[PDB]
Design a protein around this ligand. Structure first.
Ligand SMILES: C[C@H](Nc1nc(-c2c[nH]c3ncc(Cl)cc23)ncc1F)C(=O)N(C)C
Length: 163
């Protein structure tokens, strides 16, 4: 529909999805109960410092083309997208405990807890997502897990566009 997550306005342009509660295992073998969105969808993510076009299948980011003000703003959109995708490699990239016990995390649904976790440090998220060789498309660049640009390789399904 039209909703917000991690500071971005999401607007669905194609497809549809249904919700099914599912148990997932983190890289720390912690069980999380998440509402999995099933179905292929395309979205525009609109933020104050970055915008993107997201194509996602059930628990699988297919493509993310992002533009933004700078490396940091772009990385923020990428993190929000990777979390939003509900991919297994993102869930498995959680390597410590996801505290649901403490007073401050009570109002946090799993997806929002995952988001907070990766926003604190996205190093393992980016390093475990995977890289691919990229085809040459002008006006688009690949981005390595350290957010340095490359015309050779990129984080899987991720491309950076010029503003
Ligand atoms: C705020 C968002 N609200 C909505 N999310 C979705 C949605 C569609 N496909 C998705 N895929 C993944 C996730 Cl994660 C959420 C969605 N649709 C309508 C919404 F109000 C939400 O519930 N989460 C990010 C968990």
């Amino acid at each position: 529909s039209s909703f917000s997550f991690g500071g971005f306005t999401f607007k669905r342009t194609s497809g549809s999805s249904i919700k099914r509660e599912e148990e997932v295992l983190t890289g720390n073998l912690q069980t999380l109960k998440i509402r999995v969105h099933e179905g292929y969808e395309e979205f525009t993510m609109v933020g104050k410092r970055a915008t993107a076009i997201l194509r996602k299948a059930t628990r699988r980011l297919v493509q993310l083309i992002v533009s933004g003000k700078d490396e940091q703003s772009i990385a923020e959109a990428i993190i929000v997208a990777m979390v939003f995708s509900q991919e297994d490699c993102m869930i498995k990239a959680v390597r410590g405990d996801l505290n649901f016990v403490n007073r401050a995390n009570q109002r946090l649904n799993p997806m929002h807890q995952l988001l907070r976790h990766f926003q604190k440090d996205a190093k393992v998220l980016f390093q475990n997502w995977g890289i691919e060789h990229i085809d040459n498309v002008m006006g688009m660049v690949g981005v390595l897990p350290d957010m340095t640009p490359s015309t050779e390789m990129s984080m899987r399904g991720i491309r950076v566009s010029k503003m």
